[PDB]
Amino acid sequence: TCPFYKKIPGTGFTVDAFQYGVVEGCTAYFLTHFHSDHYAGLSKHFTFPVYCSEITGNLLKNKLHVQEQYIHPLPLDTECIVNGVKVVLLDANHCPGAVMILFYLPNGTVILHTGDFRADPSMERSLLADQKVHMLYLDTTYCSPEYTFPSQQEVIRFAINTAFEAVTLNPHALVVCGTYSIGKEKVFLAIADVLGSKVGMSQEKYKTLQCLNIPEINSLITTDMCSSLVHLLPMMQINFKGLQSHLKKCGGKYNQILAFRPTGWTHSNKFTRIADVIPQTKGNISIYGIPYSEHSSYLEMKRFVQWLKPQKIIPTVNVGTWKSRSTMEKYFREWKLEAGY
């Protein structure tokens, strides 16, 4: 059944709750972002109102074929009324079109639902600075102190310098980048930019990217593989067998692959710095795992929550085990006692 952490009390609203059939007493289904664990269950047959960002609304229409009459896009940073309740959508610093949602309940309670987010100090100067938030529905993906990772900026610098050096040393090297969802577009766009190439990809993935309102996108991507030296492939194909195979397909235009796998966290983060990352190499193929995260580190999550000072925290991630639930609740109490709220 729909879990309680997907329901907004004092409303008929649900968040990211499309796989339970008709949720009894739901008058509006919000969708925070276009990732499959969140939209799971949506299709052209859905006939309830969906509230989301403009970009998520483009993807619902073009990729899932949801009918336009049920898609209700809202602008960001704007007070809007939905079924008699004031809401605001805020940028979540996750993937394109990802939002956090502020609900102002008739009884005076204010609730923030982060969806998936990467906390940032810039959020401390949004519409959130303007009033008290009583309840926080929190993306707790990396809620443990082992989870450190570099800034997105540091990671992109590493990737750009690595690719540029490799291709300048060997003009017949191909760069390949993996993907299995929207998000992390900076990785392949930054590398293609330094190399003066467009990124080449399948027709399905090109269609997906043309929904994202990225400025000058027609100048940056293409379905012509032969004219491009940065290819995108399914994350599943980013391994020695899949890459050798791919190389055969390019008809001796290339004699070396340098490949990037943008992971979330991996245990080499507890020891190694970004400056010291090395690839896995077999023959003329090398694969770099780079820690490009679109979720908060433990320290970023802690700073956000200690700034916000919520009265109650409801985790939305890692809720399935008693040991995870108990560990998270211990950190929430530490944070509250350290900061004095």
Binding site for Ni ion (CB under 5 A): 35, 116
CB of 211 to Ni ion, least distance (A): 16
Instruction: Pick between residue 51 and residue 254 the one whose CB is nearest to Ni ion.
Output: 51
Report the DSSP beta bridge partners of residue 53: 74
Backbone angles phi and psi of 197, in degrees to 5: -120, 165
Rounded least distance, CB 84 to Ni ion, Å? 29
CB of 207 to Ni ion, least distance (A): 20
Q: In whole angstroms, how close is the CB of 95 to Ni ion at the nearest point?
A: 6
Handedness of CA 273, 275, 280, 286 (dihedral sign): positive
Residue pair 231/247 in contact (Cβ under 8 Å)? The answer is no
Of 35 and 205, which has the nearer Cβ to Ni ion? 35
What's the closest the beta carbon of residue 181 comes to Ni ion, in angstroms?
Answer: 8
Q: Would you say 182 and 236 are in contact if contact means Cβ atoms under 8 Å apart?
A: no
Closest separation in Å from C-beta 99 to Ni ion = 11
In DSSP terms, 14 is beta-bridged to 7, 29
User: Based on CB atoms, which residue is closest to Ni ion, 116 or 300?
Assistant: 116
Please, which residue, 35 or 113, has the CB nearer to Ni ion? 35
Helices H, strands E: what count in the chain? 8, 18
C-alpha 172 chain-centroid distance:
33
Cβ proximity to Ni ion, 23 vs 95, nearer residue: 95
By DSSP bridging, strand 85-91 and strand 80-82 are: antiparallel
Nearest residue (CB) to Ni ion, 141 versus 197:
141
Residues 6+ apart with CB under 8 A from 116: 32, 33, 35, 38, 92, 94, 95, 98, 139, 141, 294, 295
| DSSP 8-state class, residue 253 | S
